[PDB]
Amino acid sequence: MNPPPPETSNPNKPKRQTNQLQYLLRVVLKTLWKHQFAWPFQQPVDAVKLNLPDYYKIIKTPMDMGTIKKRLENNYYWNAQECIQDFNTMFTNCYIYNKPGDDIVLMAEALEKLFLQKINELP
């Protein structure tokens, strides 16, 4: 099975709008989202569709760019570091679940390289 997806709203969670979070949406997420390797990461892993009942037995903190995008658009975060942590969870999950040299890992590695280039000069 699939678990419920990560929340993208939480009314009693306190929220901030910062220039760093705006840049994460307008630049970092936008750049990754258009990439030719973005597609597996644009929504939660669908273990039912992929017939991978093991996925959510291995990965207990799922995260994906569709969730991050909605969190940024919906003003979910307190600060930029919280969002950066979500990106790192997404990449790390993929490295944990898969093996070096797998196609999905090559895709994550290319996206991570671009991610780090964009954050290397946040505002």
Q: Indicate the residue among 23 and 87 with the shorter CB distance to ligand X3L.
A: 87
Contact 97, 59 (CB under 8 A): yes
Q: Indicate the residue among 20 and 64 with the shorter CB distance to ligand X3L.
A: 64
How many residues make contact with ligand X3L (CB under 6 A)? 10
How far is 89 from 70, CA to CA, in rounded Å?
Answer: 16
- Interface with ligand X3L in residues 90-119 (CB under 6 A): 94, 97-98, 103-104
**DSSP per-residue letters across 46-104:** -HHHHT-TTHHHH-SS---HHHHHHHHHTT--SSHHHHHHHHHHHHHHHHHHS-TT-HH
Contact 37, 111 (CB under 8 A): yes
Among 24, 32, 38, 45, binds ligand X3L (CB under 6 A): 45
With binding defined as CB under 6 A, does residue 40 bind ligand X3L?
Answer: yes
Minimum gap (Å) between residue 24 Cβ and ligand X3L: 20
- In the complex, the residues that contact ligand X3L under the rule CB under 6 A are 40, 45, 50, 52, 55, 94, 97-98, 103-104
